[PDB]
Amino acid sequence: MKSDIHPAYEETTVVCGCGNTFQTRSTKPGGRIVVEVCSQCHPFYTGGRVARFEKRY
Amino acid sequence: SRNGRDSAAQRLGVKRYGGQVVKAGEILVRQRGTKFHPGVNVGRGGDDTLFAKTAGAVEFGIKRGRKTVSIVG
Amino acid sequence: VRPKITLACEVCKHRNYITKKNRRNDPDRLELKKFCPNCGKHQAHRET
Amino acid sequence: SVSATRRISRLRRHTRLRKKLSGTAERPRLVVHRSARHIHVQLVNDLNGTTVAAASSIEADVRGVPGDKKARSVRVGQLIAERAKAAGIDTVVFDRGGYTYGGRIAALADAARENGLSF
Amino acid sequence: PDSGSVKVGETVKLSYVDQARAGIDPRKTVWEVVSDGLDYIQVGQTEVPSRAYVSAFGFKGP
Amino acid sequence: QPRLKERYRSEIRDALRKQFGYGNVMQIPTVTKVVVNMGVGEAARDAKLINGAVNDLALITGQKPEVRRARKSIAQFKLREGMPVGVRVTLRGDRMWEFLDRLTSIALPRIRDFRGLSPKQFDGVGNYTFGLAEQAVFHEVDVDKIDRVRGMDINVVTSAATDDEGRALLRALGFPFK
RNA sequence: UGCCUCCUAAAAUGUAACGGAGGCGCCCAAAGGUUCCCUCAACCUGGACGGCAAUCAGGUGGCGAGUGUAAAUGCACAAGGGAGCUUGACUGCGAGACUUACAAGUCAAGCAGGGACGAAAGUCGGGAUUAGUGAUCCGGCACCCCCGAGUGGAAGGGGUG
Ligand SMILES: [Mg+2]
Ligand SMILES: [Mg+2]
Ligand SMILES: [Mg+2]
Ligand SMILES: [Mg+2]
Ligand SMILES: [Mg+2]
Ligand SMILES: [Mg+2]
Ligand SMILES: [Mg+2]
Ligand SMILES: [Mg+2]
Ligand SMILES: [Mg+2]
Ligand SMILES: [Mg+2]
Ligand SMILES: [Mg+2]
Ligand SMILES: [Mg+2]
Ligand SMILES: [Mg+2]
Ligand SMILES: [Mg+2]
Ligand SMILES: [Mg+2]
Ligand SMILES: [Zn+2]
Ligand SMILES: [Zn+2]
């Protein structure tokens, strides 16, 4: 049953708008999965109330 | 009253006992379920009737938590 | 609801068997591969 | 702990077929032991557990054999089939040992029938 | 189509009974032809049971 | 070769030996299996799972998923004993990492409110589980060729014997936390 | 008012009352046969809608679940759960036994023909067991071609289902 019922799954190079790209394997037809946000365009690297009257309110 | 009805008794129990020379095919133990289990030279039967398969004496014993009906021919 | 049916042979039409089936689960005629003593070999059997 | 699921669930299967398949003094029982490296086999005579003839795949007559692991199964099946015939044995029952029939064990069975063991 | 235009609108949900009756499969029975083997079906975006729905069209019991 | 797998035994396998004084390289954890299931409880009405529950998990994962059946009947859920209600798939080995990479890089940092996810969602062994709200933006699916949206939840099974060691393993792969 | 299970029943069998509790007059073309594999309920922790309880993962869990259907005896070795092909839910017999006033009822290894499954060993003459039934008479039907009221046929009779 590891034969011709599973969907098509070949290697797929993926690009982001940040420019950081990488090469994995997924089911997108053409190697053409396009994202606008990634895991290296963000931290996980480094990161009323009494301020009311300070505009002389 | 509402009760009062019974079924005919079925004459179960052990029929040939230990140390008893039996001929080939005699009913050793008639029962419901496998209260006794077939051992050497003893077949079970369609309603758990433990017939014999060979002439010879009958001896009883334990085999792994199930009590047995066997024949030393 | 379970009528008695009978299984005639398919080579020679002898009515060799008889049994029961459920008339609403099986609205069509049973086919089984049963023995036939006329022929001495297994053949097919439909109902009547 | 999958080195314990494999032992517990193969003497769970080995005792499943051992009920209906016994092996006696005229028709003994042939028990294979498929490890990941070798295979062992012996003929056991279940009335007093007296093994009549064994043939392992660890001594030099099988260790010096060219080929893969099935090729050392076809050789050891030619051993006990001609080690039975010094004890005078001609029909046996085949204990799978709990394993599946196919592969290394089925190549021992079809190489033990070509030398006498009538099963 | 070949030419022309078929303007539909998003204020319409389609239900289509057909001349070929191809939704009916001649191998399975009345309770699976319409209720797909399960027990409560969506009809009017509601929870009406299957056996009680087919019985509304005459097919009941046997 | 999946790039998260080569990243695994290169330095992370070296990292944990400094943290715990082990005596064998067999006691170091490794993620063994990752399990995804929809759990479509709505599927007990109208059978919207054929083009609805098999195909959508197929493009997310890569292989066809197992449709599961219910162990016993429940009246209030309108659910029998034997009706299809859940759709499970399982990821082992070299397909597991290619789901762990592509979750944690182009799908999981499409999840807002960056406290990561909770590091208190382990069980007592080192096995994690998080959830997803809708059919996420795994970009392999498209929003114009789907039925109604449906979430999922994703198990991750490890060889850990305690939670923080399982937390130490899964942090270093691409799971954000706080 | 017949049939099945328990108790009364005095530790074999058997045993009454208008004594005490319940069931049956069916169901299954797979819920049968076989080869192969698996272990439950309940409880705790983690989780999208999810709640005491749907689906998932991991722990502890030796029978407290399950058995088509009442109860008892049973069954984890599984008879419980799942899957692949199949029709032994056969035809010709049946040594020897159980029960038994009689009529009945029950069990049956083994022999052959022809099969199913299994690599073989082997198992299979319905169902975990015990109920789901009704004598004789007289008729119906299909087949075998046994007798055919002078002879050839026929009518009718007869036989095995
Ligand atoms: Mg009684
Ligand atoms: Mg059917
Ligand atoms: Mg008594
Ligand atoms: Mg007494
Ligand atoms: Mg079956
Ligand atoms: Mg079973
Ligand atoms: Mg019959
Ligand atoms: Mg007789
Ligand atoms: Mg034969
Ligand atoms: Mg064959
Ligand atoms: Mg027989
Ligand atoms: Mg019976
Ligand atoms: Mg009269
Ligand atoms: Mg005449
Ligand atoms: Mg006539
Ligand atoms: Zn980016
Ligand atoms: Zn015929």
Side-chain angles (χ1 to χ4, degrees), chain C residues 2-37:
Chain C
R2 311 289 295 264
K4 291 184 282 293
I5 58 171
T6 175
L7 298 181
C9 182
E10 286 293 325
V11 178
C12 56
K13 275 77 178 174
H14 286 191
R15 295 188 176 177
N16 290 320
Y17 288 99
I18 184 154
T19 181
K20 289 192 180 189
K21 76 179 176 67
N22 197 348
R23 192 262 316 282
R24 287 176 290 180
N25 298 330
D26 299 332
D28 54 353
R29 299 180 293 174
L30 285 176
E31 291 87 4
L32 281 76
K33 295 279 188 184
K34 300 294 277 287
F35 183 88
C36 184

Side-chain angles (χ1 to χ4, degrees), chain F residues 143-164:
Chain F
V143 73
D144 283 330
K145 297 298 289 183
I146 53 170
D147 53 349
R148 67 181 67 251
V149 298
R150 55 182 66 88
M152 66 197 74
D153 50 350
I154 295 164
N155 295 113
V156 171
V157 181
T158 64
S159 294
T162 180
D163 280 331
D164 55 355

Side-chain angles (χ1 to χ4, degrees), chain D residues 2 20 25 44 72 82 89 111 115:
Chain D
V2 295
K20 200 164 68 176
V44 292
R72 291 188 300 277
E82 75 186 3
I89 307 299
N115 291 111

